[PDB]
Design a protein around this ligand. Structure first.
Ligand SMILES: Nc1ncnc2c1ncn2[C@@H]1O[C@H](COP(=O)(O)OP(=O)(O)O)[C@@H](O)[C@H]1O
Ligand SMILES: [Mg+2]
Ligand SMILES: [Mg+2]
Ligand SMILES: [Mg+2]
Ligand SMILES: [Mg+2]
Lengths: 320, 228, 186, 319, 305, 228, 319
DNA sequence: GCAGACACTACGAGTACATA
DNA sequence: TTTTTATGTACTCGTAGTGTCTGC
């Protein structure tokens, strides 16, 4: 196949972790800049950061090493305190690999705040040992990497594709998910649900696979799963009609019905009213719904908070 | 199976290399540091009768001083480590191998670039001095038909410019010339006489000490230099 | 003092050359001199409408907000970044303040209250023996003068003045004038 | 069938479900848990409510029970970074010697000051993913950092479909009935049992906790039914004090109804609607809606109620 | 009647000892009897919000009646490291007479403690077998929702017209008895009936009052209220941090006390100003500043009589 | 009154159990924690000559290592204290009894459900295993006829299942079954031989440690389990 | 002219300047360094940026090189009190036997936990001032205790005059050009070299590091210029749809950036600040700040983002 | 054989950062 | 020209106290 499987793992977003830089699904310019790097055979100091999780930062870190055939120490960022850098990393960085391999230190998830002291200590280290070995830092949030370490690196920024990349990357990820299903014994009844999972959590490829596990309970993905993935469980007609008619007892009665799950309902209402009302009623309807959504969760009685939203819209909406 | 003083003094050593260890049945034991810099192999008195992974070596060895010098040991029904005493009994968590960075097997040592030997009497004086002299790294080169050894202070020194120490090992029969530098820190061997095996295939390069008990390999330093 | 010719070696030279580190230390301790900050060139710029641009210097949303908290001309703007500002970039919280609080001047003195150090120890005490929080404790003291004679109870409690407890009240040898002070006139 | 712990008197903990089936859950949710226990291995999971007592921390223990995991159970707030470095790293690296899935249940992990520990965990979860998995239980998700949600299957509770709600309620009524047989509680009117369930629906803990308090008399009769459906009273004293536009009285009634606000605020909307003029209705929703909206930011809730009364007193024109 | 003779303050040395000695609503007293009967005590919350209704008294009484081993704790002292340390010790330890263990956390309302309260939510389930918790609160919203889920929330304050008339009689008898013990001379019984009626719901203040009469044995907010009238600021700016400490209580007193001291349409303004300030507290990041802002607002708009 | 070398050491020790103490006239001291978990009594050979309350103990024993050993600790002339010295005089505060939690209950351990002894060197081995083998609870019970101890790990092993430690304490002859569990935290004795008397009826109960230099009694944790 | 180290591939460290002239600096600064190397003896000096890669630690080694000092180079974070007592006292007291100024370079000495070492150093500097001098390098001065700044000439970097900036940039362009000749990098459009310099101005390290990554194809042409001046993520589609005050478009972009909100909201503040009028700034913070503040209460996050857009569309008066 | 001297730990000081 | 909120969590430094083990 075209796909690495680790087979020591059941957890399945980790079974399918890409082995090499090509197996990785990335923005065009980004993949190309990584090929360029593996080509020159030596690896500079690099930072990979999302801030969206699961874009492939810590996967590409291991792949880069794999492609250049580095001698690589992989390290949990939160474990890398100043005494670690002084002790084991200084050892590794000064020691000579005997097979003339680029030495590389991968510090994963290095953006914690209490490591600033370690990071500063590292700034002088990186210039001393730059001849042997390079450092690849992985971070969710850059501002947790001190500025002088960004100076020292090529900062590559993830999950920020072009409009075309997004369209291609999505196709690639759909093909991949399809392939994972063949292997896994997951039946695909409606391809539309696979395109939906991808689109739903786009930048994050980890959650996108994680999802597939949880919607596979029944070994099939059919039109019924598609309802839960897009899921709208929604027809709004009784409210939309009671709104136009500007009646209230009815609105007052419908409140408790949809208070049940609010975040979904409020969403449909925005989507559905948009089409049914005049142009400067649109701008008003976002101001009214937006504000109402905003305070939900401070508001103590949620059913009343829904009633309050209806009254507001009934009066200010002028229906085309 | 039981273990004696001599055995353990070893493992308390092998601890300072890798705080964990994986070991199986035989009179052989081994560990290599997590980071890929050193490694030791050992033939020993006492006899191993089952495979087991120890996460916290440096403290298991410790627990072991907490009962008599004779208590028998084995694989518990509980697939963990049972240190059983005359009166008491301990049950030490055997860890998942996944997590104990061990060497799959044993890799042979390149028939050596260069050979010489060192008296244990001599090597005690090197360590001894190094505290006294803040000697943090060393270099073994060829000064006038003999194999010397030079201690430095990479700290104050920087370029290994000035020699603070210089044992004088064997003589040099062959006709290359080199300078193999060694991180003192990376030198974790219970003292005793050694044969010395040096090697380099250009940028490749390592160093093997051949004891009476175990063999040790340490990585040269980044600009160990030579014509091999 | 022999030899009788020494261009005096400075306090330092002796510390070091002789290599007793405890004397070297007190020679170190010599300059501890603790002060820092320059946060008032930031306040100043927000006020005078000069240009700093921040970024380079450390910024304190607490320190800038509090400083301005002084002059009522500002409160509207600080009030704002107080409700809303939690969660804005220091770069932002600064840019905002530049474009809101308008005039400029302020002179120094903040308002800090006057603590009767004694009165505080007394309330802190009462709230301890009585497992009440500070407001009832104050009620107790008001009450406990006007009958039941505060000396009766301060005499019982003089028991726990534990000098861990004093460190909670004041920060200096004012704190040792107090160990003695309720050990006395009850 | 029902599991009883018998070391506990406290009775919402006596009846805590042992297995995934004993649990009352939405259809798709139960099914997704069966699916999981089937495959025999357990992924990294987050269970969150935010409504308390939906069964999150119960289903956590049950999942473990069904797959027969070796499980360390841990108070979230006790779970600081040095804990993860020390005892959890130990457990996660050690090999269970019967070949059991190792699982670490961190209960109520949504505290703010643990973000540092959670980040530290993000690298851990990938290192030890082979041995053992983590099940996190949270009331509020936003207290779990994003990269941990990335690493998990986030299952969201107490948000059933309309059908699930109807089934779950039936199941919970059957269960309460069974608990009563065991406990020596006499059921005179089944209508009171259906009432307790409906009353606090999402929360099954409070729904059982209630049963303890209305059982003082060992029987549930039509008389208990009045107290279960019952009251919060009429609103008359407030509605009158509002018309009269007096204050000392309003000021005095505030603390009374501060007790349960969300209910009171609801009655007030419902009852005033009828009693005031047409454009007073539109104003009354803006006044009550806004007040309800900030409650829970507002620190002193009794004062917040007074503030509502003063506002209505002035702007309400009464019929 | 019940006397703790070593206590020098009136409210501490007279507190009803048992659930019966307490003056309560009928259904409330009966629910407490019911509880003491079953011999074991569940997790409970008692809340007013009106002070001196007897919450923290009934807490100790419940314990007394079931003969619990009880640790009593100031709420504001119960931070997360206390729950981890001494309370975990107590809750895990077994009482050796087989007594219900109970932890009374008094006045647990302030959300300085929310972190502690959450930590508690997992705790309560872990040691529910040994020991139960009784929380006392003036304002409920200061108790996180998942703790309310775990408890029986009992609420104070809705006496019937008859209860009020009986309770007042009972309190008058009680005050009389306190006077015999204390050496306080009653010349006119009318004054005793007056003290009771004057602050009715609040039995604490009604006894605290009696002490004030104490100096001849026969029968506050000021610094802010003053600085407000004077319309000065440096002083208001300085007082802010003082009362920022516990806001929900302070704001409460300010409403109560200003009401009397200011003109009629200044009252309507003062509720709009304090109400709005109270409302956003807890979005507002710096709470000391938020108190300052309230002061500035009132200084300007208030007209004092 | 004067306080010896052995008395003061049962005073640093009673500080680990209460911040404050109240000893009174006699040759008897006793204290127990503000959380009623832990009771400790001790009969000293220095005869305390009056009734005193100290808010803090471990504070007092401090101003006492300095003074020489004459130390006629008398009572100050205003209710506080006087430490008389060979050549000085010091004044410690003295707390109103309302500010110290004092036992007040020299209740007598009923009768032992079962009795057994423990050797001091073998308290040693356990007070120390638990440290680095990470134990925080133990359970005293019957295995193969003798009475054993099990150490566990309440956190890792949530329900006392995998035993990290066992210790054998000399047979039980009586015919009962039991499992008494103690939270290591609430265990605070300086080593030594100790008679072990454990009592319980039904569910209420405790364990009493008789030692030649003090007595100790603590509470079974929540779940302990027997048939007495 | 250009020093190349040739033991390094990493290329911003290959071209590290050997001497004080090879360094690209403000006029007055270069001149003050020449002045220093002339007198032949080197005083105690502090070089600080706070902008990284302005050449502090490079000029440190160069100053030594020019005066031919015997120099110990030391990582700041490694220089704890026992180091100063130990290794440094040795070196500072020992006599260089060629009569060379002894110099101790402490690089990146601005760490907080070294204040104890720094004080210990203040006495040292006066004792050994005759032998040897100290050159401290720091990113943030306030991390250097005041009495050490008293004892030094504090030289402050990367804060050139308007003229210096214009000259320094020309000098840096010339240099990059020269680096390209040496490296085999073809320059098709000089405009792209002037662009790399301008883009990252204060930081000369990143400006060279960039050149490595845009050289993948060995040529710099008009096509690379698009990527150098271009913005790879950006905000443009939103900023534009905001100006145009259209909605369907704003309504559509909402779900796009709801993905990671905390970052997006940040950019929007940063980017709108420049593009809108002065009292629109004050309004935009109130609008964005409030929206950010309630995020995480708000249940539908995509809607909450739409709400933010509608708000800004109307109230933003665009310069 | 015991001191000496080494290696390790516990603690308090100062810094920091996210919440309210 | 002015100057630091309260709770909880995490990390580095120096030093002092603590314990196990070896050379003349
Ligand atoms: N129901 C009651 N019966 C008698 N006295 C009471 C009652 N409630 C409160 N008190 C008085 O108040 C004091 C204790 O107040 P407390 O129970 O703390 O009130 P709260 O809980 O409202 O703060 C006691 O001194 C007691 O005399
Ligand atoms: Mg990762
Ligand atoms: Mg729970
Ligand atoms: Mg009270
Ligand atoms: Mg540098």
């Amino acid at each position: 196949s075209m796909i690495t499987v680790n087979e020591k793992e059941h957890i399945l977003e980790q079974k399918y972790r890409p082995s090499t830089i090509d197996e990785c699904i990335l923005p065009a310019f980004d993949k190309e800049t990584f090929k360029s790097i593996t080509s020159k055979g030596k690896i500079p100091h690099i930072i990979l950061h999302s801030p969206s999780p699961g874009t492939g930062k810590t996967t590409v870190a291991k792949a880069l090493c794999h492609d250049v055939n580095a001698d690589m120490m992989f390290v949990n960022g939160s474990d890398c305190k100043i005494d670690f850098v002084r002790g084991p990393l200084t050892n590794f960085a000064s020691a000579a690999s005997f097979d003339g391999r680029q030495k590389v230190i991968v510090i994963d998830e290095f953006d914690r705040s209490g490591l600033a002291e370690s990071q500063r200590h590292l700034r002088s280290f990186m210039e001393a040992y730059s001849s042997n070995c390079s450092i690849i830092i992985t971070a969710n949030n850059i501002d947790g990497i001190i500025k002088p370490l960004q100076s020292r690196c090529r900062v590559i920024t993830f999950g920020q594709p072009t409009d075309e990349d997004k369209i291609e990357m999505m196709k690639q990820m759909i093909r991949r998910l399809t392939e994972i299903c063949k292997h896994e014994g997951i039946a695909i009844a409606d391809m539309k649900v696979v395109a939906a999972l991808v689109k739903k959590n786009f930048p994050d490829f980890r959650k996108t696979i994680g999802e597939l596990d949880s919607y596979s309970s029944k070994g099939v993905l059919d039109a019924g799963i598609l309802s839960l993935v897009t899921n709208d469980r929604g027809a709004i007609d009784d409210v939309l009609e009671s709104l136009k008619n500007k009646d209230v007892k009815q609105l007052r009665a419908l409140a408790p019905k949809y208070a049940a799950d609010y975040s979904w309902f409020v969403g449909k209402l925005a989507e559905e009213i948009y089409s049914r009302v005049t142009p400067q009623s649109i701008i008003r309807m976002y101001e009214i719904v937006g504000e109402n959504n905003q305070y939900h969760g401070i508001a103590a009685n949620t059913e009343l908070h829904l009633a309050y939203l209806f009254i507001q819209l009934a009066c200010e909406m002028q229906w085309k | 199976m039981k273990l004696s003083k001599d055995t353990t003094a070893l493992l308390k050593n092998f601890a300072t290399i890798n705080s964990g260890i994986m070991l199986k049945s035989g009179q052989f034991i081994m560990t290599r540091a997590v980071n890929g810099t050193t490694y030791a192999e050992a033939n020993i008195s006492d006899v191993i009768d089952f495979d087991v992974a120890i996460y916290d070596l440096n403290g298991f060895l410790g627990i072991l001083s907490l009962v008599n010098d004779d208590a028998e040991i084995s694989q518990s029904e509980d697939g963990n480590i049972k240190i059983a005493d005359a009166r008491s009994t301990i049950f030490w968590p055997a860890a998942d191998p996944s997590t104990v960075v061990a060497p799959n097997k044993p890799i042979p040592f390149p028939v050596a670039s260069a050979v010489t030997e060192i008296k244990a009497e001599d090597l005690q004086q090197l360590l001894r001095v190094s505290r006294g002299l803040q000697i943090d790294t060393i270099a073994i080169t060829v000064k006038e038909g003999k194999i010397v050894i030079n201690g430095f202070n990479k700290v104050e020194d920087s370029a290994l410019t000035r020699v603070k120490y210089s044992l004088t090992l064997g003589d040099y029969d062959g006709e290359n010339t080199f300078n193999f530098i060694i991180n003192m820190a990376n030198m974790k061997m219970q003292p005793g006489n050694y044969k010395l095996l040096l090697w380099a295939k250009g940028k490749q390069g390592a160093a093997k000490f051949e004891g009476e008990h175990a063999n040790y390999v340490v990585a040269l330093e980044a600009d160990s230099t030579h014509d091999f | 003092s022999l030899f009788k010719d020494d261009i005096q070696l400075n306090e330092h030279q002796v510390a070091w050359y002789s290599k007793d580190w405890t004397a070297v230390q007190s020679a170190a301790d010599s300059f501890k001199e603790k002060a820092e900050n320059e946060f008032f060139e930031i306040i100043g710029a927000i006020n005078n409408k000069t240009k700093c641009s921040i970024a380079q210097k450390d910024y304190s949303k607490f320190m800038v907000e509090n400083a301005l908290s002084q002059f009522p001309e500002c409160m509207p703007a600080v009030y704002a970044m107080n409700l809303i500002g939690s969660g804005l970039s220091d770069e932002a919280h600064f840019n905002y303040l530049m474009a809101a609080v308008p005039r400029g001047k302020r002179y120094g003195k903040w308002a800090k209250l006057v603590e009767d150090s004694t009165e505080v120890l007394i309330i802190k005490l009462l709230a301890k023996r009585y497992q009440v929080n500070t407001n009832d404790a104050i009620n107790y003291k008001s009450i406990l003068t006007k009958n039941g004679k505060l000396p009766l109870v301060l005499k019982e409690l003089k028991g726990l003045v534990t000098d861990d407890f004093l460190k909670e009240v004041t920060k200096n040898v004012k704190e040792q004038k107090q160990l003695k002070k309720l050990a006395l006139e009850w």
